Design a protein around this nucleic acid. Structure first.
Ligand SMILES: [Mg+2]
Ligand SMILES: [Mg+2]
Ligand SMILES: [Mg+2]
Ligand SMILES: [Mg+2]
Ligand SMILES: [Mg+2]
Ligand SMILES: [Mg+2]
Ligand SMILES: [Mg+2]
Ligand SMILES: [Mg+2]
Ligand SMILES: [Mg+2]
Ligand SMILES: [Mg+2]
Ligand SMILES: [Mg+2]
Ligand SMILES: [Mg+2]
Ligand SMILES: [Mg+2]
Ligand SMILES: [Mg+2]
Ligand SMILES: [Zn+2]
Lengths: 193, 140, 135, 64, 103, 136, 39, 77
RNA sequence: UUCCGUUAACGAACGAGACCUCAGCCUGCUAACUAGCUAUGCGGAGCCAUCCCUCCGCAGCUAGCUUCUUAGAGGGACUAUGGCCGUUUAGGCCACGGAAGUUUGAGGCAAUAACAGGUCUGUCAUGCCCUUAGAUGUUCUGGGCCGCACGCGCGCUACACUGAUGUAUUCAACGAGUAUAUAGCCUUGGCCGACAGGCCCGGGUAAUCUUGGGAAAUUUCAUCGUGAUGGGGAUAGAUCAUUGCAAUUGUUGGUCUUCAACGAGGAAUGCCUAGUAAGCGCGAGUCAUCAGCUCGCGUUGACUACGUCCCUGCCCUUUGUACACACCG
C-alpha cells in the first residue's frame, strides 16, 4: 500500500476496505490505478460497456450531482459541493470519509426488483436479481436524489444535506432517503417472489 | 543548452511550454502556476509536478503561454504542456532511460497527459437546435 | 511583483492605499449611480469607487492603450430582459472616464498617443511597491 | 429465516423479457461449488459478476 | 533602382492559383531576385444558406452554398519593369493579378 | 436585544414591518422601490445593516424628511416618478395613496378626452399595443 | 423599393455580399455564379 | 426557524447563543458546523452567521470560510 | 440485393459502397513582417540594490526560426498484427500498439416507380378562361393584415439558497463591414452626460481597422434566510432619447414608480446514445428601426443503454383472402 496520492491532498486512499465481495470489482477505490487528487477527470467513459466500472466512485457521485437542467454542466460547483460534504463527514465521524461514502454506496443498493416478464404465454411481473453494476448505479441515484430533495426549499446547504445522507446510509439507519427507497423496492420485489 | 518548446491541446485551447535550464520556475502567462485560478481544478495543473516531484524540475524554468478554449480546457492543455515538455526534455538532454521512467509514471496515472483528446464539438444540423436534438413534433 | 500576488488581495491592498494615501476628488453622484445600465442597485460597498480604481489601474498596468469604450466592455456583463432572453450589456462610461481622469490627477496613468491609456513609470513603481506587501 | 447467498455468473445465456431488459445467466454457488442454476438478472452483467441472492431455491427455466 | 513590389493573387480555385503562383516565383528565381513568398492568407468562405423549396411546404430543408476565395502574396525587390516582364506570362482563367508598390 | 424593538411601524399609512432590514422594509410604501429606498437610506445617513425596528425615531423623522422633499436633499431630477407633471409642472415623488389617486386622475383625463388609451382602459382591453388573439 | 435583379420580385431577397437576388432565382443561378454545394 | 427575524429579540442579545446554547450544539459530535446546525437546532442563519463571528472575536471556536457561504465549527480542542 | 457460397441460369445496368466537404494526427516538407516565437540590445518597475533574478515596453541585416498561427503538397488506418469463435470462407468478438480500430466522427450526393402532395402569390415559366378605361392595369392618400368571450401548435421567462443581488476576477469560435455623401458601412480613440445619447480628431474595401473579437454560464468575497421573500417580472403612470418622411392601437432603447399569475404542473405527449442531452452566451439572415425565430458557432459538460420486437412502424420469406380506389377494403 505505497500509494501517496490523496484526494484534494487531504484524504488517504490507503485503508479503504470494501466488505462486499459482490461489488468489490465495481467500486474503484481499492487499486492504485483508481486513486486521484480530484474527482474531475475528463474521462472518455460511456464509449464501451462496463467502462464506467473503472470511473472513480467519487467522480461517479460528483457526476450525479449536476442534475435538473439549471445545474447541467456545472461540474466545478459539484466538485466544491463534494469537497465540503467530505470535510463535514470527517468533521462528524472523525473517520476516513471515503470509507463512509463506500459504505453508504454498498448499503444503499437494492438486491431484488419486480418487472413484467412473459411466462409460458402470459405476461405478469416476477422478481429478478440486480447486477452489481446496476446496484452501484441505483445506489448513487438514490443517495443523490435524496440529498437534492432534502436541499430543495430549505436553508440547509446541499453539501450538508449530502453529508447527512451519506453518513446515515453508511450507518444503514432507516432514516435516509436511500435506505427507505432500497427497502421499499426490495419489499415490492419480495411480495411478488 | 537545454531548451524545448512543447504544446498541449484540448477542445480548442492550446498551451505551449518553453523550457530553459533555470532553477524551479513555472509561470503560465507570467504568473506562478500556484495561481491558475479556477482553484477547484488547481490540483489538476499540479498533477504532473507531484507526479514527478519538484526535484525533477530543479534545473528548468517553464514559461507556459496558454490561449483559446475555456477555463477547464486551458487547465487540461497546461497539464499536457508540463507533461510532454518534461518528456521531451528528458528525451533530448537527460537520458533515454530516465525519460522512459517518467513516461511510465505519467502514463500509468492518465493516458491524456501525453495524448490529446480528439473530441471536438459536433456541428449543428437544421431541424433542431443541436447536433442531435430536433424540434418538438406535434401531430394534432 | 503584481503578477506574483493574487489579484483579489492585491486589489484589496491597493484600494486601501488610495484611501489613506492622501485623497482624490469624489463626484457628488457617487452614492446614486448604478455603474451599469443593466444593474439593479448601486454598488453594495460604500468604498466601491476606490475598489473600482484599484481594480482598474491594474488593467492599464497589464495592458496598453485601453480607451473608455473598452473599459465599458470590460465591466459590462449579463442583462436579463424579463421575459425575453438575456444578452450582453456594457457599463457606464462616466465612471470609467472619471476614474481614469483622477488617476491622471494623481499621476498613476496617463493618456497615450496612438490612443488609449498607459501606466506611468511612477504608477508602475507604487503598484509594485504595494505588491511587495501582499501576503 | 433466509440468509443472503452469494453466487457467481459463470456463463451468460441470453436476453429474456418482452423488451429484452432481462438477462438469463447460469450462476454457481461459492460455498457449494457444485450447484449451478439458472437465474434472471436486471442490469448489465458479464461473465464473472457476483450476484447476491435473497433466496437460493428459485431456479429459472430455458428462455423464461 | 530596387523597390518593394507586392503582387497579390486571388482566386476561387486552389490549383489554378497555385500554378500561376509557382510560375511567378520561379520566373523571379531565375533573375536571382529576392522573392519572399508565397504567403497564404486565411481562406475566405462566402456562405449563403437558402431554403430549397420555392413555396414553403413540407419539411424545412436548407442547402448551404459556399465560395472559397484564396489570397496569395508574393514579395519582390526590383524595378517595376523587370516584374512586368515576369508578370506577363500566360495567366489561367479566374486568377487576379494586382501588382502594386508597398512603402 | 432591541428592547423597544417594534414589529409594526405605520409609516405613511403602510404598516411597515419591524422584522426586516430598513432598505427593504421601507419598500412596503407604495411609491418607493428598492432604488428610492436605497437613496433614502443614504441621504438620511442610516446604517443600512440595521433592521427597521432597531431604529431610533429621530432617524425616522429624517426618513420622512427626505421622502417628502426629494428635490431638497439634492436627489436628482431623473430619479423621481412624477417628472414634468401635466396638472402642475413639478418634479415630484408621489407616495403611498397619491400614487393611486394620481393614476385614476390620469385615466379619468383620458376617459373624458375620448383618447385611444382612455377607451382601451375603459373597455378592459390591453392599452400598450400587445396582441390579443390568444393572450389575457 | 428593393427588388430581385433577375425577376423584380419583392420577397425572399438576398442582399448579402451585394447579390440582390430572390431566394429562388439565386438557387436557379447558384452554380453559374459560383456557389458550390460542398456540405 | 426565523433566524434572521430573530436577530433582535431581547434573548438573542442577552445570553442565548453566548454559550447558553452553542456550548452543546457543536459538542453532539464534539464538532458540528454552525452552518450544519442551522436546522438540527432549528435556528437558521444570519442571526447566526453574525454570531459565528462573535465567537471568533471571543476566542471560543475555529472556522473555515468558502464559496457557498460554507462555515464550520469546532468546540474547544 | 455487402459478401461467401448454392445454383436453369449466364453475363450486365442503376441504387449501397467507392466518391467529395469539414473535423481529428504530423517538432516531417514548402514558406511567411497582413502570424508569431526565440535570443540579443536598448527603455521602465521591483529587489542582498551593482551586476544577477523576475515582469512589461520598444527597434532591427538576430535566428543553423517555423513549435505555436495560416494554407498548400503529401503521409497516416488497411481491421494491419495477436488470440478465440466461423464452412475454420465471408466475417465476428478480444487485445498490445496507435492521433484514430462503430465505415474515426459529422455531413453533401443519392435508384425504379409514384402522389391528382405543395407551389399559376418567385420567374416578361406557361394552356385555357375572366377583365382590360367607369380597369381585376398602374400610381397616390388614409385604414387593415396586429382587431378579441374562446380552442390549438412551436416557443421565451420562471416558480429560487446546486439561488438572486453587489464587488473582485476573465477564458472562445463561426462570421460581418454596397461612394456606406463629402466622414459614411463596421467603428477604435478623446471630451460632455447618471443612463439614453451626443460632438471632435481618425482606421479599415480589410490575417493590416473595428477585433489577440477583454461573451455568458463559471470562479471569488459579501448581502439576503424558507418569507409569493431581496424568487418572478406580467399589467400600468409619468418622463427622456434614438431610427425614420411620418412611431397613434405604445418601433426600439433609457429613468423612477406599479409587483399580477406562477408552490415543479391531470389525462396525454416529444427529442435524445458522447464532447452527445441539457445549461450558457456570440455571429449571420431578415434590417432605416425592430429577433422571444431560423441558420451557424464556440463555451461548461453528464444520467442511462450497448438490448429488444412489447407498443408504433420498416425490409425479406412462407401463408390466407369474397380486397385491387387495395382494411380508411
Ligand atoms: Mg436549500
Ligand atoms: Mg437563461
Ligand atoms: Mg459516411
Ligand atoms: Mg411556380
Ligand atoms: Mg396603400
Ligand atoms: Mg417549426
Ligand atoms: Mg428579481
Ligand atoms: Mg454574480
Ligand atoms: Mg416590423
Ligand atoms: Mg440581426
Ligand atoms: Mg420568421
Ligand atoms: Mg382461410
Ligand atoms: Mg374486385
Ligand atoms: Mg374494416
Ligand atoms: Zn428573382
Amino acid at each position: 500500500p505505497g500509494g501517496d496520492v490523496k484526494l484534494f491532498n487531504r484524504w488517504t486512499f490507503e485503508d479503504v476496505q470494501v466488505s462486499d465481495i459482490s461489488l468489490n470489482d465495481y467500486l474503484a477505490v481499492t487499486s492504485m490505478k483508481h486513486y486521484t487528487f480530484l474527482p474531475h477527470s475528463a474521462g472518455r467513459y460511456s464509449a464501451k460497456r462496463f467502462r464506467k466500472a473503472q470511473c472513480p466512485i467519487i467522480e461517479r457521485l460528483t457526476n450525479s450531482l449536476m442534475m435538473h437542467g439549471r445545474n447541467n454542466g456545472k461540474k466545478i460547483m459539484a466538485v466544491r459541493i463534494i469537497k465540503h460534504t467530505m470535510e463535514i463527514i470527517h468533521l462528524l465521524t472523525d473517520a476516513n470519509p471515503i470509507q463512509i461514502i463506500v459504505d453508504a454506496i454498498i448499503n444503499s443498493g437494492p438486491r431484488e426488483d419486480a418487472t413484467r416478464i412473459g411466462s409460458a404465454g402470459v405476461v405478469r411481473r416476477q422478481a429478478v436479481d440486480i447486477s452489481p453494476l446496476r446496484r452501484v448505479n441505483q445506489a448513487i441515484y438514490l443517495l443523490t436524489t435524496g440529498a437534492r430533495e432534502s436541499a430543495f426549499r430549505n436553508v440547509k446547504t446541499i453539501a450538508e444535506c449530502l453529508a447527512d445522507e451519506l453518513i446515515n446510509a453508511a450507518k444503514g439507519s432507516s432514516n435516509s432517503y436511500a435506505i427507505k427507497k432500497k427497502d421499499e423496492i426490495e419489499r415490492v420485489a419480495k411480495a411478488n417472489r | 543548452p537545454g531548451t524545448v518548446q512543447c504544446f498541449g491541446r484540448k477542445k480548442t485551447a492550446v498551451a505551449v511550454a518553453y523550457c530553459k535550464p533555470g532553477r524551479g520556475l513555472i509561470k503560465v502567462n507570467g504568473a506562478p502556476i500556484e495561481l491558475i485560478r479556477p482553484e477547484m481544478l488547481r490540483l489538476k495543473a499540479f498533477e504532473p509536478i507531484l507526479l514527478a516531484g519538484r526535484s525533477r524540475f530543479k534545473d528548468i524554468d517553464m514559461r507556459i503561454r496558454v490561449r483559446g478554449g475555456g477555463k477547464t480546457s486551458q487547465i487540461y492543455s497546461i497539464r499536457q504542456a508540463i507533461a510532454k515538455s518534461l518528456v521531451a526534455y528528458y528525451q533530448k538532454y537527460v537520458d533515454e532511460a530516465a525519460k522512459k521512467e517518467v513516461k511510465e509514471i505519467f502514463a500509468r496515472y492518465d493516458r491524456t497527459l501525453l495524448v490529446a483528446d480528439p473530441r471536438r464539438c459536433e456541428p449543428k444540423k437544421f431541424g433542431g437546435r443541436g447536433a442531435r436534438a430536433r424540434f418538438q413534433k406535434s401531430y394534432r | 511583483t503584481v503578477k506574483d500576488v493574487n489579484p483579489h488581495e492585491f486589489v484589496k491592498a491597493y484600494s486601501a492605499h488610495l484611501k489613506r494615501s492622501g485623497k482624490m476628488e469624489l463626484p457628488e453622484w457617487v452614492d446614486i449611480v448604478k455603474t451599469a445600465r443593466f444593474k439593479e442597485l448601486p454598488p453594495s460597498d460604500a468604498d466601491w469607487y476606490y475598489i473600482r480604481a484599484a481594480s482598474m489601474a491594474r488593467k492599464i498596468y497589464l495592458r496598453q492603450g485601453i480607451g473608455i469604450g473598452g473599459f465599458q466592455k470590460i465591466y459590462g456583463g449579463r442583462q436579463r430582459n424579463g421575459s425575453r432572453p438575456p444578452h450582453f450589456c456594457k457599463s457606464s462610461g462616466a465612471v470609467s472616464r472619471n476614474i481614469l481622469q483622477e488617476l491622471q490627477k494623481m499621476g498613476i496613468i496617463d493618456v497615450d498617443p496612438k490612443g488609449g491609456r498607459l501606466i506611468t513609470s511612477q504608477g508602475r513603481r507604487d503598484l509594485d511597491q504595494v505588491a511587495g506587501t501582499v501576503p | 429465516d433466509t440468509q443472503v447467498k452469494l453466487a457467481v455468473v459463470v456463463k451468460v445465456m441470453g436476453r429474456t423479457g418482452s423488451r429484452g431488459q432481462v438477462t438469463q445467466v447460469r450462476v454457481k454457488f461459492l460455498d457449494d461449488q457444485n450447484r449451478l442454476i439458472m437465474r434472471n438478472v436486471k442490469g448489465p452483467v458479464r461473465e464473472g459478476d457476483i450476484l447476491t441472492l435473497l433466496e437460493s431455491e428459485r431456479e429459472a427455466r430455458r428462455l423464461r | 533602382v530596387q523597390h518593394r513590389i507586392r503582387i497579390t493573387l486571388s482566386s476561387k480555385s486552389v490549383k489554378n492559383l497555385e500554378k500561376v503562383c509557382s510560375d511567378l516565383v520561379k520566373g523571379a528565381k531565375e533573375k536571382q531576385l529576392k522573392v519572399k513568398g508565397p504567403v497564404r492568407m486565411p481562406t475566405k468562405v462566402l456562405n449563403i444558406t437558402t431554403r430549397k423549396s420555392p413555396c414553403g411546404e413540407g419539411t424545412n430543408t436548407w442547402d448551404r452554398f459556399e465560395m472559397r476565395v484564396h489570397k496569395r502574396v508574393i514579395d519582390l525587390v526590383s524595378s517595376p519593369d523587370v516584374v512586368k516582364q515576369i508578370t506577363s506570362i500566360t495567366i489561367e482563367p479566374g486568377v487576379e493579378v494586382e501588382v502594386t508598390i508597398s512603402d | 436585544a432591541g428592547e423597544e424593538f417594534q414589529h409594526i411601524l405605520r409609516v405613511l399609512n403602510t404598516n411597515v414591518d419591524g422584522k426586516q432590514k430598513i432598505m427593504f422594509a421601507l419598500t412596503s410604501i407604495k411609491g418607493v422601490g428598492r432604488r428610492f429606498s436605497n437613496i433614502v437610506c443614504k441621504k438620511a445617513d442610516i446604517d443600512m445593516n440595521k433592521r427597521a425596528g432597531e431604529l431610533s425615531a429621530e432617524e425616522m423623522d429624517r426618513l420622512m424628511a427626505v421622502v417628502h422633499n426629494p428635490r431638497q436633499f439634492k436627489v436628482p431630477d431623473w430619479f423621481l416618478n412624477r417628472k414634468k407633471d401635466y396638472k402642475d409642472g413639478r418634479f415630484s415623488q408621489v407616495v403611498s395613496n397619491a400614487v393611486d389617486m394620481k393614476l385614476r386622475d390620469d385615466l379619468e383625463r383620458l376617459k373624458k378626452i375620448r383618447n385611444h388609451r382612455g377607451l382601451r382602459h375603459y373597455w378592459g382591453v390591453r392599452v400598450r399595443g400587445q396582441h390579443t388573439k390568444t393572450t389575457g | 423599393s428593393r427588388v430581385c435583379r433577375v425577376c423584380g420580385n419583392s420577397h425572399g431577397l438576398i442582399r448579402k455580399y451585394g447579390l440582390m437576388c430572390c431566394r429562388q432565382c439565386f438557387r436557379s443561378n447558384a452554380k453559374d455564379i459560383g456557389f458550390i454545394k460542398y456540405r | 426557524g426565523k433566524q434572521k427575524e430573530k436577530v433582535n429579540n431581547a434573548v438573542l442579545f442577552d445570553q442565548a447563543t453566548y454559550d447558553k446554547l452553542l456550548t452543546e450544539v457543536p459538542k453532539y459530535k464534539q464538532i458540528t458546523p454552525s452552518v450544519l446546525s442551522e436546522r438540527l437546532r432549528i435556528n437558521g442563519s444570519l442571526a447566526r452567521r453574525a454570531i459565528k463571528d462573535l465567537m471568533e472575536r471571543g476566542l471560543i471556536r475555529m472556522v473555515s470560510i468558502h464559496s457557498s457561504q460554507q462555515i464550520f465549527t469546532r468546540a474547544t480542542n
